[model samples]
Target: MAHHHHHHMGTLEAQTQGPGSMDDELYFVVRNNEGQYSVWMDGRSLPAGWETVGEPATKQQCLQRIEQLWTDMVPASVREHLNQHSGPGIDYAVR
Candidate 1:
């Protein structure tokens, strides 16, 4: 018989569990220039340029709101370009 070992990395629990645990902490939803959203723990300083989008909530709650709002998954600039220039019989592809 052979035994195998597994390791996990970069999970939220792994990131947040430490001497200063965030098990019961609140988080805020922030948006970057690209229009992507992420959770930032409340009470801590935010990242340098990201802007807060909504009130603070539990990590799960903030994730839910982000899930509902960030549906397009398109960059703001690209979306704007598509809105402005995309038209009849035009196909756009990224390669």
Candidate 2:
């Protein structure tokens, strides 16, 4: 596993198994002024301004995509804790 920190006003910490096919192991945590959230992926964090655009087949699909992203890069232990502790999605309304 590896760790990295983003020291923007709101510190975002990250961890991942190891650098696989991608440049670095995919993992990230962010608590921006807007909200507190974390992201997990198979490689490095997506670009700074990442926005998904597409027609959603259903709410389930949306949730599934989020889940896949979360679980893919997260360690099993972290994933479990997140499942039990964190809020629903990346865009947490609570500040």
Candidate 3:
């Protein structure tokens, strides 16, 4: 087979994928459709189907906001399904 020219890499700089690599700039509280919370750096835009809850701020503040808002870690639709199916009458199945 001929050379496919498939090798691809960008930038001469070392690649990084973690917050510890560099000093994280201001962050924003990001949430997806299920209302799960996370932090997004100021430079990069939100990924598909995600939205920012408020303006950018320090990671600590943003995380606190997430803790305040995201009371339930479970996704909404799954919670609804579980709630509807749950019957209070327990058969008392022992361990």
Candidate 4:
């Protein structure tokens, strides 16, 4: 059995917002070459390796679109390359 709890905190900044916080800004859903989706705030333009996949919307809206359409969990390129080495039987590679 493993039960661990910290009674004293070591770092304040690390525990402050914890990265999951969303502010009142608009976001864009972008996809990488791997077909993974994520958001960037409206102020900055598209990141170097990602392109916009949906209209700019509030965080929740953009996330909703991502949840609706991001069907495959594996990276597109990984699946393709793996299929080459994997040979027959399975046909998800056709997708």
Sort the candidates on TM-score, descending order: 1, 4, 3, 2
Which candidate number would show the highest lDDT if scored against the true structure?
1
lDDT of every model, 2 decimals: 0.49, 0.32, 0.47, 0.48
Return whichever of 2 and 3 wins on lDDT: 3
On the 0 to 100 scale, the lDDT of residue 65 in model 2 is 37
lDDT of 3: 0.47
Kindly indicate the candidate among 3 and 4 with the higher lDDT: 4
Candidate 1 residue spans exceeding 4 A from truth: 1-24, 72-95
TM-score of each: 0.46, 0.22, 0.44, 0.44
lDDT by residue for model 3 (10-29), tens: 22211111233245566776
Ranking by lDDT: 1, 4, 3, 2
Better of 1 and 3 by TM-score: 1
Winner on TM-score (1 vs 2) = 1
- lDDT score of residue 31 within candidate 2: 28
lDDT of 2 at 49: 60
Output the number of the TM-score-best candidate.
1
Error of 1 at 73 (Å): 11
83, model 1: CA deviation in Å?
Answer: 37
Pitting candidate 1 against candidate 2, the one with the higher lDDT is 1
